[PDB]
Structure 1
Amino acid sequence: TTECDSKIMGTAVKNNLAIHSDLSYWIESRLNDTWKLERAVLGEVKSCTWPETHTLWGDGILESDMIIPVTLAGPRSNHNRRPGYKTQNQGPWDEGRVEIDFDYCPGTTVTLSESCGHRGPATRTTTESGKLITDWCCRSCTLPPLRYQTDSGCWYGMEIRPQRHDEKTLVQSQVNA
């Protein structure tokens, strides 16, 4: 356990946009009906504690609701939330640069259905051979879906699963936070 360097660290909220940022993290939460996470640019994923001194809206937080895990320098902030999503302990955190937003991966769809599997490791939309997986689902997430963008392609949040079970060479996250 340790605390992130606050030397180059800027946290600001103004005009319906809240930002938590440092040298490698840029996290944006916005007000549209309600406040929620909108974008996160993580140059490199790191492991430290985001200092409370630079944390907005940090009263009574549910750690399991923190989209970016608190162990991964995710701000202990209610801005670090999105309805229908829990902490992304099995996101593609080992891919290097990782960008999070809430939007569909190109060529794919996501459907709310009770017939969907549980939260699992984040899955890339393209197989090893580059084949696209088009049909996805989630049990109780909200739309637009949680999306990851790394150097190898586009991924979905833990809540979003491929709804076909004959998917073979699936590329998934192997990390556990």
Structure 2
Amino acid sequence: XXXXXXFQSNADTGCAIDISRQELRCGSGVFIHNDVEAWMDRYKYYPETPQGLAKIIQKAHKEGVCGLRSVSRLEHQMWEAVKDELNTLLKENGVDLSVVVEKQEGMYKSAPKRLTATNNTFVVDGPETKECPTQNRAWNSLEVEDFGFGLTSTRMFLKVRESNTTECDSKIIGTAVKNNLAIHSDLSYWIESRLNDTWKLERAVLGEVKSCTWPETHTLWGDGILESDLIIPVTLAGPRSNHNRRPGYKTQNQGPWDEGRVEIDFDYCPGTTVTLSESCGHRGPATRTTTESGKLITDWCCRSCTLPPLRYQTDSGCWYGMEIRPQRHDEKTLVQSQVNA
């Protein structure tokens, strides 16, 4: 599964039903789909030329770049799928260099080196090592040049970026608002806000947690921003937008951002309560509702949040927002986020 290559036509054209207006309507415009919560991946990354990429790497290798960290899971999946190919490319040209791709657990961190146009390894992702520290790795060096048709999925071809930026690739971003529901999204983030008495964040699904910055061009309601109010941190591709807020909550810099997939919404973790209490503990690291031993922590408080509570759902269970604390300071087997972003 990695085949190599080697009616306004700028717009979407089709039909949809608008459930709110209760109208079936055809024509042209902009259609944003939910691709984060989709069964398969409709999209796969590809290099414009594997040979080109191999050249990019060996060059960066000469200039002392020991490896790379992917921007996203999709990018990782490319490096994973194209490594054997890149390696036979180097091998057959007499280049003493092999690409090595390690499993990625947790958030995709940024790095400061950049691949440019044109030991003996190039290490993609993995744990932090003294041998190949992040500071000598490349990150966010590629972007989408063109899209390629496929039967099963659609191809995205990567070129080398012309400049140095921390911005997420805008080619794959879809932001939209209609019927007072607002969506900031790309291939791995789906962030939904809605008007109900007030405008506020309602739900978010993060396929992984990345470290690029959400571009202003693709951001709604981005005036008069106070970053410390932004639920999802801008250092974690949180859109710098007033939609990325919830009354009674500040930036979740210590949310469980290193668990892999994270779903944010506002409801109670199963079998728990949350109470307003001026005697509750101050905000701290996001905390799970099950201990290491597995037992359920039922009673929770908050000093000044609003209900329903900010809830995180991950592979290992349910967590609460930073402002929500265990009512009883007696449980010692806590599982808490050790992130600071």
- TM-score tier (shorter): over 0.9
Q: TM-score, normalised by structure 2?
A: 0.52
**Gapped regions of structure 1 (runs ≥ 5):** none
Which residue of 2 is the match for residue 63 of structure 1? 227
Q: 1:41-96 CA distances to partner (integer Å, 9 max, x unpaired)? A: 00000001100000000001100000000100000100000000000000000000
Q: Distance in 2 between matches of 1:117 and 1:16?
A: 36
Q: CA deviation at 1:8?
A: 1.1
Q: Distance in 2 between matches of 1:13 and 1:23?
A: 18
Q: Distance in 2 between matches of 1:96 and 1:163?
A: 28
Q: CA deviation at 1:16?
A: 1.6
**Gapped regions of structure 2 (runs ≥ 5):** 1-164
Q: Give the fraction of aligned pairs with identical amino acids, expressed as a percent.
A: 99
Q: 1:97-141 CA distances to partner (integer Å, 9 max, x unpaired)? A: 000000000000000010011100000000112100000000000
Q: TM-score, normalised by structure 1?
A: 0.99
Q: Distance in 2 between matches of 1:146 and 1:114?
A: 18
CA RMSD of aligned residues (A): 0.7
Q: 1:25-51 CA distances to partner (integer Å, 9 max, x unpaired)? A: 000000000000000100000001100
Q: Distance in 2 between matches of 1:8 and 1:76?
A: 17
Q: 3-state DSSP class of the match of 2:171?
A: coil
Map 1:18-167 to 2 at 5 A.
Answer: 18-167=182-331
Give runs of ≥4 in structure 1 deviating > 3 Å. Answer: none
Q: CA deviation at 1:165?
A: 1.0
Q: CA deviation at 1:18?
A: 0.2
Q: 3-state DSSP class of the match of 1:175?
A: coil
Q: Distance in 1 between matches of 2:293 and 2:207?
A: 26
Q: Distance in 2 between matches of 1:165 and 1:34?
A: 34
Q: CA deviation at 1:20?
A: 0.1
Q: CA deviation at 1:6?
A: 1.1
Q: 3-state DSSP class of the match of 2:170?
A: coil
Q: Distance in 1 between matches of 2:313 and 2:171?
A: 28
How many equivalent residue pairs?
A: 177
Which residue of 1 is the match for residue 338 of structure 2? 174
Q: CA deviation at 1:168?
A: 1.1
Q: Distance in 2 between matches of 1:52 and 1:8?
A: 14
Q: Distance in 2 between matches of 1:15 and 1:103?
A: 23
Q: 3-state DSSP class of the match of 2:300?
A: strand
Q: 1:4-30 CA distances to partner (integer Å, 9 max, x unpaired)? A: 011111000001210000011000000
Structure showing greater relative contact order (alpha-carbon pairs closer than 8 Å, 6 or more residues apart): 1
Q: Distance in 1 between matches of 2:180 and 2:287?
A: 32
Match of 1:5 among 165, 169, 181: 169
